[PDB]
Amino acid sequence: HHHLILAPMVRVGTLPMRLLALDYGADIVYCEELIDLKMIQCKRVVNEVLSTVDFVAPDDRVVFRTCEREQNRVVFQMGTSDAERALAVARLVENDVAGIDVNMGMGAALLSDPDKIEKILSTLVKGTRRPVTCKIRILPSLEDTLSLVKRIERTGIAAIAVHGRKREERPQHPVSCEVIKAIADTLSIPVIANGGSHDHIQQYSDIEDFRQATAASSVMVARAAMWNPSIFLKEGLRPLEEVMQKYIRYAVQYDNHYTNTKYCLCQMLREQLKSPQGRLLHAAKSSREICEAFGLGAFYEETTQELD
Ligand SMILES: Cc1cc2nc3c(=O)[nH]c(=O)nc-3n(C[C@H](O)[C@H](O)[C@H](O)COP(=O)(O)O)c2cc1C
Ligand SMILES: [Cl-]
């Protein structure tokens, strides 16, 4: 069995989506990118009410929320440009996560500064027992990409995710499978293929096809999982209505901010946002209003009473 990974996605990658992807067969779940400058201000809070581990900012906002169900499968992705700050964030979350990822697709800007990438990654590798990973974008020239990935490997990281697109490449531009294959061949660490949604990934069987075309260790899915998290289910895609209700149940059970639930459902609805249900969802001013838009009003009242 080759690993099915939920790609890190800002706003999308909150707890309900990670748990939903796990239900449908994802082996590893990356969280949304969280900026180190925000994380360093947080305190670890055990939440008995929700049975979660919360990372709470001084304004009482829960920045990251995790639970036991995903403890051995959640990869924390940080946005960082400083090694000491990166390590302090890693030290905060390491007991509640299975991996620490560094965003290098801060982000794309880091690829132009390999001394910084190297400093941050080597500091993380030496500072935590958790496997350290990074997610990169391919460089304009193959030789530069190959030198870069070898230099990153020499830091001691556990694996590398490769989005087969260059910094200036829009989602409409095709992915470079041949470049991902060149990286996988030159490295002894696992290489995770990425950048395959829509153009290559529309159904489950497409995942293994993308892995074989890139000769990679595993596949990381973003857009296709965002549109329908049941993309990870070997038996085939589940009806969207069924997936959205399953999503809302987790959003309510783990007290997800209604604007975040609304955003994730909007991403799944796509063209169906013009339907009466898509309209009810856009108008929703609370979690109860999202639930009533999807026939989960009674579930909301029952769940709420138990949590209160
Ligand atoms: C809504 C959205 C948010 C994203 N946020 C992140 C992020 O937090 N971290 C990251 O490294 N990449 C982020 N990405 C990039 C994806 O992880 C991924 O590299 C890209 O979508 C290509 O994979 P795909 O073809 O499976 O969608 C984001 C992509 C989308 C669609
Ligand atoms: Cl990216």
From Swiss-Prot:
**Activity modulation comment:** Inhibited by canertinib, PD 168393, AST-1306 and PF-6274484.
Sum up the protein's function in the record's words: Catalyzes the NADPH-dependent synthesis of dihydrouridine, a modified base found in the D-loop of most tRNAs. Specifically modifies U20 in cytoplasmic tRNAs. Activity depends on the presence of guanosine at position 19 in the tRNA substrate. Negatively regulates the activation of EIF2AK2/PKR.
Q: What is this protein called?
A: tRNA-dihydrouridine(20) synthase [NAD(P)+]-like
Of which family is this protein a member? Belongs to the Dus family. Dus2 subfamily.
Q: Does the keyword tRNA processing belong to this entry?
A: yes
Q: Which GO terms describe its cellular component?
A: cytoplasm; cytosol; endoplasmic reticulum; mitochondrion
Q: What is its main location?
A: cytoplasm
Q: Which residues of the full protein are shown?
A: 14 to 328 of 493
Q: Where is this region: Catalytic domain?
A: 4-308
Q: Which organism is it from?
A: Homo sapiens (Human)
Q: Which residues bind FMN?
A: 8-10, 33, 77, 135, 163, 194-196, 222-223
